[PDB]
Design an enzyme around this catalytic site. Structure first.
Site, mmCIF file in Angstrom:
data_model
loop_
_atom_site.group_PDB
_atom_site.id
_atom_site.type_symbol
_atom_site.label_atom_id
_atom_site.label_comp_id
_atom_site.label_asym_id
_atom_site.label_seq_id
_atom_site.Cartn_x
_atom_site.Cartn_y
_atom_site.Cartn_z
ATOM 1 N N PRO A 70 41.557 37.646 22.074
ATOM 2 C CA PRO A 70 40.744 38.572 21.285
ATOM 3 C C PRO A 70 41.574 39.248 20.185
ATOM 4 O O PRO A 70 42.613 39.786 20.506
ATOM 5 C CB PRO A 70 40.258 39.614 22.307
ATOM 6 C CG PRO A 70 40.321 38.900 23.642
ATOM 7 C CD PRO A 70 41.468 37.917 23.518
ATOM 8 N N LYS A 114 35.645 38.515 18.236
ATOM 9 C CA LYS A 114 36.410 39.451 19.108
ATOM 10 C C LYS A 114 35.760 39.506 20.502
ATOM 11 O O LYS A 114 36.478 39.268 21.499
ATOM 12 C CB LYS A 114 36.521 40.818 18.419
ATOM 13 C CG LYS A 114 36.492 42.047 19.320
ATOM 14 C CD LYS A 114 37.734 42.250 20.150
ATOM 15 C CE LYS A 114 37.631 43.472 21.037
ATOM 16 N NZ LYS A 114 38.961 44.055 21.326
ATOM 17 N N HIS A 133 43.366 46.473 15.962
ATOM 18 C CA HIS A 133 44.359 47.039 16.916
ATOM 19 C C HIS A 133 45.375 45.962 17.325
ATOM 20 O O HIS A 133 46.552 46.315 17.531
ATOM 21 C CB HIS A 133 43.645 47.672 18.119
ATOM 22 C CG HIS A 133 42.728 48.788 17.746
ATOM 23 N ND1 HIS A 133 41.398 48.578 17.427
ATOM 24 C CD2 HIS A 133 42.941 50.117 17.629
ATOM 25 C CE1 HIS A 133 40.833 49.731 17.133
ATOM 26 N NE2 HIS A 133 41.758 50.693 17.250
ATOM 27 N N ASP A 184 41.297 42.031 16.960
ATOM 28 C CA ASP A 184 40.670 43.104 16.142
ATOM 29 C C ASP A 184 41.787 43.776 15.333
ATOM 30 O O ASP A 184 42.913 43.243 15.345
ATOM 31 C CB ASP A 184 39.875 44.073 17.025
ATOM 32 C CG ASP A 184 40.697 44.804 18.074
ATOM 33 O OD1 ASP A 184 41.896 45.036 17.829
ATOM 34 O OD2 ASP A 184 40.128 45.137 19.131
HETATM 35 C C1 I9U Z 1 40.225 53.744 19.223
HETATM 36 C C2 I9U Z 1 40.263 53.248 20.668
HETATM 37 C C3 I9U Z 1 40.741 53.945 21.763
HETATM 38 C C4 I9U Z 1 40.580 53.128 22.871
HETATM 39 C C5 I9U Z 1 40.994 53.544 24.283
HETATM 40 N N1 I9U Z 1 40.036 51.977 22.453
HETATM 41 C C6 I9U Z 1 39.685 50.901 23.166
HETATM 42 C C7 I9U Z 1 40.414 50.436 24.259
HETATM 43 C C8 I9U Z 1 39.985 49.314 24.960
HETATM 44 F F1 I9U Z 1 40.698 48.868 26.029
HETATM 45 C C9 I9U Z 1 38.835 48.636 24.577
HETATM 46 C C10 I9U Z 1 38.371 47.399 25.350
HETATM 47 C C11 I9U Z 1 39.024 46.113 24.850
HETATM 48 O O1 I9U Z 1 38.772 45.707 23.764
HETATM 49 N N2 I9U Z 1 39.948 45.412 25.731
HETATM 50 C C12 I9U Z 1 40.604 44.176 25.340
HETATM 51 N N3 I9U Z 1 40.493 43.540 24.185
HETATM 52 O O2 I9U Z 1 41.259 42.417 24.221
HETATM 53 C C13 I9U Z 1 41.872 42.343 25.452
HETATM 54 C C14 I9U Z 1 41.477 43.435 26.170
HETATM 55 C C15 I9U Z 1 41.954 43.714 27.621
HETATM 56 C C16 I9U Z 1 43.039 42.733 28.130
HETATM 57 C C17 I9U Z 1 42.909 41.317 27.547
HETATM 58 C C18 I9U Z 1 42.831 41.304 26.026
HETATM 59 C C19 I9U Z 1 38.109 49.088 23.488
HETATM 60 F F2 I9U Z 1 36.980 48.434 23.097
HETATM 61 C C20 I9U Z 1 38.533 50.211 22.792
HETATM 62 N N4 I9U Z 1 39.842 52.075 21.103
#
Ligand code: I9U
Ligand code: NI
Length: 313
Positions: free
Chosen positions: A257, A240, A261, A259
């Site tokens: 990436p 990830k 989500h 995960d």
């Molecule tokens: C439970 C919860 C609530 C929230 C606001 N997050 C949350 C949000 C995030 F934005 C991130 C950062 C992230 O992973 N950004 C990304 N991953 O793949 C990509 C992006 C950005 C664009 C290209 C693809 C995180 F680590 C957690 N989790």
């Protein structure tokens, strides 16, 4: 002594870049989980640090306005030619996003619908070091708490650049600063928790096992598959986080990436299921990334950014 500039306050310190709002929307990019170093300090005015300099950015419907704080006892002036090129490259404005949006839309009806409201969501080209350690802090976290850890880390370890109002700006620290014997203990006091171990260990690993940040520059010109495997050798860097760094720092636009989500969205919106592991797994996550690359093509990571950003709002 010095304050955050608005476009009304001191117009004579701003330079413009001919940038349609269809090509870039600051409010869907700068705080959309790519960089954690931008804040809307005044309305429609985004302040942040880029390579030992502070910027404030605002935009019309056809223009991107920017002003630099060179952060020293120097005569205040407008952005230079070389400084504007740095910002042009940072937003990757050479690549047309309108042409990409239409290309993605032609093979995906779900994207076509979302894309209408959420235009100008593009992929930032970040410093590898900043991106690496920012995304080691991203594990089991939210944008707000990540933003706090990165700021506190930078104040503690990074050099001071300038103060604007109450906000003190620090450049991102070098690897040697994060690799020291007290580094993990300090980072735990700053609230990083377990992530403090990976930050120090990964800083130590790149220096000793890989030979400093020139290694990350090598991964920039290396193939996506080679870059990803190299990154996964670092403490706290898995598939990830490796994909995040690849997409956002090492010029791998096909990096997606994945995960839990991304699984949720893929399943709910595309009806995707793993073609044995009913839930997420390393193999099933790898299959989902391939599915999106097959669908969107070699800029699948940029297409994911549009959906990811649209999901946050
Ligand atoms: C439970 C919860 C609530 C929230 C606001 N997050 C949350 C949000 C995030 F934005 C991130 C950062 C992230 O992973 N950004 C990304 N991953 O793949 C990509 C992006 C950005 C664009 C290209 C693809 C995180 F680590 C957690 N989790
Ligand atoms: Ni189902």
């Amino acid at each position: 002594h010095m304050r955050h500039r608005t476009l009304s306050s001191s117009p004579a310190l701003w330079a413009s870049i001919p940038c349609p709002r269809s090509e870039l929307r600051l409010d869907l990019v700068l705080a959309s989980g790519q960089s954690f170093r931008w804040k809307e300090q005044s309305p429609a005015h985004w302040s942040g640090v880029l390579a030992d300099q502070v910027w404030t950015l605002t935009q019309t419907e056809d223009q991107l306005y920017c002003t630099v704080y060179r952060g020293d006892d120097s005569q205040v002036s407008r952005p230079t030619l070389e400084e504007l090129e740095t910002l042009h490259k940072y937003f990757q404005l050479d690549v047309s996003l309108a042409q990409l949006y239409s290309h993605w839309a032609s093979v995906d009806s779900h994207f076509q619908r979302v894309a209408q409201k959420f235009q100008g969501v593009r992929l930032l080209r970040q410093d590898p070091t900043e991106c690496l350690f920012s995304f080691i802090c991203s594990s089991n976290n939210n944008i707000a708490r990540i933003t706090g850890m990165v700021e506190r880390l930078c104040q503690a370890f990074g050099p001071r650049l300038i103060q604007l109002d109450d906000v003190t700006y620090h450049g991102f620290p070098n690897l040697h600063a994060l690799a020291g014997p007290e580094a993990e203990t300090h980072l735990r006091k700053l609230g990083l928790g377990y992530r403090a171990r990976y930050v120090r260990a990964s800083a130590k690993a790149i220096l000793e096992e890989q030979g400093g940040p020139a290694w990350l520059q090598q991964l920039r010109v290396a193939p996506y598959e080679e870059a990803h495997k190299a990154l996964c050798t670092l403490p706290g860097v898995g598939a990830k986080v490796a994909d995040c760094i690849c997409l956002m720092a090492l010029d791998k636009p096909q990096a997606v990436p994945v995960d839990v989500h991304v699984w949720q969205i893929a399943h709910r919106d595309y009806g995707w299921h793993p073609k044995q592991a009913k839930g997420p797994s390393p193999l099933a996550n790898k299959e989902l990334g391939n599915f999106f690359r097959n669908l969107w093509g070699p800029y699948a990571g940029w297409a994911q950014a549009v959906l990811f950003s649209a999901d946050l709002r």
